Amino acid sequence: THRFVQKVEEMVQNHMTYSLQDVGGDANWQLVVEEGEMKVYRREVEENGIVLDPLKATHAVKGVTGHEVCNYFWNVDVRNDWETTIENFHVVETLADNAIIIYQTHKRVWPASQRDVLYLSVIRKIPALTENDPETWIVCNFSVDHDSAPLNNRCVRAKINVAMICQTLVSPPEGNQEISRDNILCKITYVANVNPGGWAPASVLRAVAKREYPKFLKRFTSYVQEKTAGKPILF
Numbered sequence: 001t002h003r004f005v006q007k008v009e010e011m012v013q014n015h016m017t018y019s020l021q022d023v024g025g026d027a028n029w030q031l032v033v034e035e036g037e038m039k040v041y042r043r044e045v046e047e048n049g050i051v052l053d054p055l056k057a058t059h060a061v062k063g064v065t066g067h068e069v070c071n072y073f074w075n076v077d078v079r080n081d082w083e084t085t086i087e088n089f090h091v092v093e094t095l096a097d098n099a100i101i102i103y104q105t106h107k108r109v110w111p112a113s114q115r116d117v118l119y120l121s122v123i124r125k126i127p128a129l130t131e132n133d134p135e136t137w138i139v140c141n142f143s144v145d146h147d148s149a150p151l152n153n154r155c156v157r158a159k160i161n162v163a164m165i166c167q168t169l170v171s172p173p174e175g176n177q178e179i180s181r182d183n184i185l186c187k188i189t190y191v192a193n194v195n196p197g198g199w200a201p202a203s204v205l206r207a208v209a210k211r212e213y214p215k216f217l218k219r220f221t222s223y224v225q226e227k228t229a230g231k232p233i234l235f
């Protein structure tokens, strides 16, 4: 019932419609890196000189659930334990138990101006048709406007639409036995569409993205694996 409910539903449903489509067999999409179960793809797109390069990654992370992965991705209290591209951030507003607006500044990359971002971050469970099947969990981070964080002259305001979409697969054990983490897999689709908000040199931006996206996916998924080990499974 907060004011962004309609916008949230739009962004989430657009991800469920378009962000899970195949890119492995798409000629416009290029494999950047493959390491283990992680695959990172990019489509090279510049629009009026501005590098927009859609990014899509997939991963399959043993021993964690989608609910767990999304909780850790969304929870600002653990953000600094895994995120390495930020200088500073704060929660601007709490909209609901599952939705917040965050302001953050990113590490500066020479020669371009420092970027900042202002986004709504929402975590949502998408039920299957019935409880016979696993729900999908999604975290969506998308730029919004807010009076407490106006455009400023110190940073260029980037515009983002990012999603982490998690499906959980279980190999059920025999008879009356308990489910172990060894028999759960979380399939992650991560999509980032970032508009740098103003001019930036293409070669510079592209090398940083190519480095930072897989670094993040490896570091973040390992972090969740580490922190959930020995804890009861949260489905």
Ligand SMILES: CCCCCCCCCCCCC/C=C/[C@@H](O)[C@H](CO)NC(=O)CCCCCCCCCCCCCCC
Pocket (backbone or CB within 6 Å): 083, 084, 085, 086, 106, 107, 108, 109, 112, 113, 115, 117, 141, 158, 160, 162, 194, 196, 200, 205, 206, 208, 209, 212, 213, 216
């Ligand atoms: C040490 C170099 C770092 C430079 C970082 C400058 C990027 C500024 C543009 C805004 C990027 C928004 C990233 C999305 C963040 C949130 O959803 C979330 C929680 O923070 N983290 C990720 O999704 C994890 C996202 C991982 C970020 C990958 C890096 C993106 C590179 C894109 C190229 C822009 C370069 C900036 C212009 C010079």
